[PDB]
């Protein structure tokens, strides 16, 4: 019943005291955070409190969309020796700091995601050459489907790959994806290995990567410029915004204190120093 | 008029959408549908139909009749496997081309119990008992009867009832497994071993063969459609 938008408990008036009750004392040893209120130690007047936690509820903490990647595509001239670059990005929040740290506060979570795609383009060669408005395709290849090979092979016939066709110069594109985990919650951390090295086998085939699980494998996104070759080369970038919605979490962990290094929890040398200098005696 | 505002996504063609649109042939009289016998409602039903697994895909035997015939014999009793098979209903070449397999190539996560049925095809006079086993994954794949033995298995017995069915119960960590070759979500191993030996009287073919069938049980289901790797149009 107590919703997020409820007023915090009104602080009671309390006067002088000389009793055997000891509020003030604890023994953090138990592990219990001593639960005192202002009125417990000092004298308080009555106060009708109006502040509510409404803007810090799990929902609101993740309520902002966030950049997750920068995918590069381009459409060079047909005369060019280099091949028309189509980008393929594996879907993982771990590619950028920002969302990851916000997600790390929790061991597990269930969240239906909403993706937004802002696509910006530009010329490269200093030619007063033109280019007609381009049309992009963002194809979601789920784990195991054939990943595109050429900017123009069959794979793009999207028989079943849910795709999006975005014309440039229009409002950014957006799609909703429900919770797609193979579990009951997405694992932000996986302690263990996929393969158990067996006693009657080669170490090679018995070896995997620590903290690498399928739990967080979700296929790739394929992006290409649909318009064919154009005399004047035009590169473009596709920024992907992810905003977790209908979110819920489990088990708090301490926030990441030193610069992240790679997909694991691992850290690099030099970066292991977070706090600064300050004196024990200077306020 | 009515003040509105175009939000993110206006003009984005989603191949997977579900919006109404205009009609290109107003008032067309749709021809009424008859009752054609045999209407399918869901892909899973097709998956519940038995299909012969091509167990032997050896160099010479692949892509030729010999692929669906597992050859047993009247040799003396040994503790060696007759046939091995990774329970990867979509990634293992052996399962990959069966009906249950083919439907799986259009999904990302399969789930539920799978069943293996074997049909003996030798003489009426020949008899025996073969052990069909299912070991959940995570240990050395069984190589000697002994070990297969320890896991989930059914000891068949050849007779007047020509076919034996083994159910492979859904025992797995996740709640659906990756339809691809993945360790984390691996499936296990199925194996067949001579429990006794196949005995034949005199003047009877000494080497008869078996046929295998796979299919889904009532609790099987799949999800998240994807395109298939089982076809390609070059150019």
């Amino acid at each position, epitope marked *: 019943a107590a919703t997020s938008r409820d007023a915090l408990p009104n602080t009671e008036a309390s006067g002088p005291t000389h009793s055997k009750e000891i509020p003030a004392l604890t023994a953090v040893e138990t592990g219990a955070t001593n639960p005192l209120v202002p009125s417990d130690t000092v004298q308080t007047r009555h106060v009708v409190q109006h502040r509510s936690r409404s803007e810090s509820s799990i929902e609101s903490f993740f309520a902002r969309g966030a950049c997750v990647t920068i995918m590069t595509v381009d459409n060079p001239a047909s005369t060019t020796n280099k091949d028309k670059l189509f*980008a*393929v*990005w*594996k879907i993982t929040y771990k590619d950028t700091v920002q969302l990851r740290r916000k997600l790390e506060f929790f061991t597990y979570s269930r969240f239906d995601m909403e993706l937004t795609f802002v696509v910006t383009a530009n010329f490269t060669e200093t030619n007063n050459g033109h280019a007609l408005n381009q049309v992009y395709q963002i194809m979601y290849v789920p784990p195991g489907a054939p990943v595109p*090979e*050429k900017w123009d092979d069959y794979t793009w016939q999207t028989s079943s790959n849910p795709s999006i066709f975005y014309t440039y110069g229009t409002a950014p594109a957006r799609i909703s994806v429900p919770y797609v985990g193979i579990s009951n919650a997405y694992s932000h951390f996986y302690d263990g*290995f*996929s*393969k158990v090295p067996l006693k009657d086998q080669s170490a*090679a*085939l018995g*070896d*995997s*990567l620590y903290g*690498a*699980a*399928s739990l967080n*494998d979700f296929g790739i996104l394929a992006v290409r410029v649909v318009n064919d070759h154009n005399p004047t080369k035009v590169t473009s970038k596709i920024r992907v915004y992810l905003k977790p919605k209908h979110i819920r979490v489990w088990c708090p962990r301490p926030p990441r204190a030193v610069a992240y290094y*790679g*997909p694991g929890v691992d850290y690099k040398d030099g970066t292991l120093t977070p706090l600064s200098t300050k004196d024990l005696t200077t306020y | 008029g009515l003040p509105v505002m175009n939000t993110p996504g206006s003009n984005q063609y989603l191949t997977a959408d579900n919006f109404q649109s205009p009609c290109a042939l107003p008032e067309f009289d749709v021809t009424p549908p008859i009752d054609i016998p045999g209407e399918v409602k869901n892909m899973m039903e097709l998956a519940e139909i038995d299909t012969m697994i091509p167990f032997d895909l050896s160099a010479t035997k692949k892509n030729t009749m010999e692929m669906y015939r597992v050859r047993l014999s009247d040799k003396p009793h040994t503790d060696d496997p007759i046939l091995c098979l990774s329970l990867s209903p979509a990634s293992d070449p052996r399962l990959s081309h069966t009906m249950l397999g083919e439907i799986l190539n259009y999904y990302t996560h399969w789930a539920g119990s799978l069943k293996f049925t074997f049909l003996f095809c030798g003489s009426m006079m020949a008899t025996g008992k073969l052990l069909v086993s299912y070991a959940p994954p995570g240990a050395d794949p069984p190589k000697k009867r002994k070990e297969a033995m320890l896991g989930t298995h059914v000891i068949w017995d050849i007779g007047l009832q020509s076919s034996c069915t083994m159910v492979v119960p859904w025992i797995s960590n996740t709640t659906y497994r990756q339809t691809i*070759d*993945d*360790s*984390f979500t691996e499936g296990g191993y199925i194996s067949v071993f001579y429990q006794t030996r196949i005995v034949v009287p005199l003047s009877t073919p000494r080497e008869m063969d078996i046929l295998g069938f796979v299919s889904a049980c009532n609790d099987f289901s799949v999800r998240l459609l994807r395109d298939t790797t089982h076809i390609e149009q070059k150019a």
Partner: nanobody
Amino acid sequence: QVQLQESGGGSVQAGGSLRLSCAASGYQYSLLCMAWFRQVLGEGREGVAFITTYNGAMRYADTVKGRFTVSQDKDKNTVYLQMNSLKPEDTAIYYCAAGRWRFGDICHEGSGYNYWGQGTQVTVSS
């Protein structure tokens, strides 16, 4: 298709040290399992050392192990092969193959390798 632009052979004598560079063209990220090889003149076409793109873990061939070290240029998509202690028998047409990957499984020889390199030959004179 992934392209593997290799570089750059030569027949220096015993104990030598050269190196091969091979690009991802290609989309080096989580996929490719950049491996090394050398075709022992018609004998002959063995796998040297192979690196994992995702983590940077190397494994070598029982032959090359130690002298040869596989290096990785993550950001500029190149995988090197510091060919050390080049002895006469380090004469063979070098290779650079790169397959895909198993999400978490280490890049080994029994694993890859889908795509092929140029095959730039390095010979060790005698």
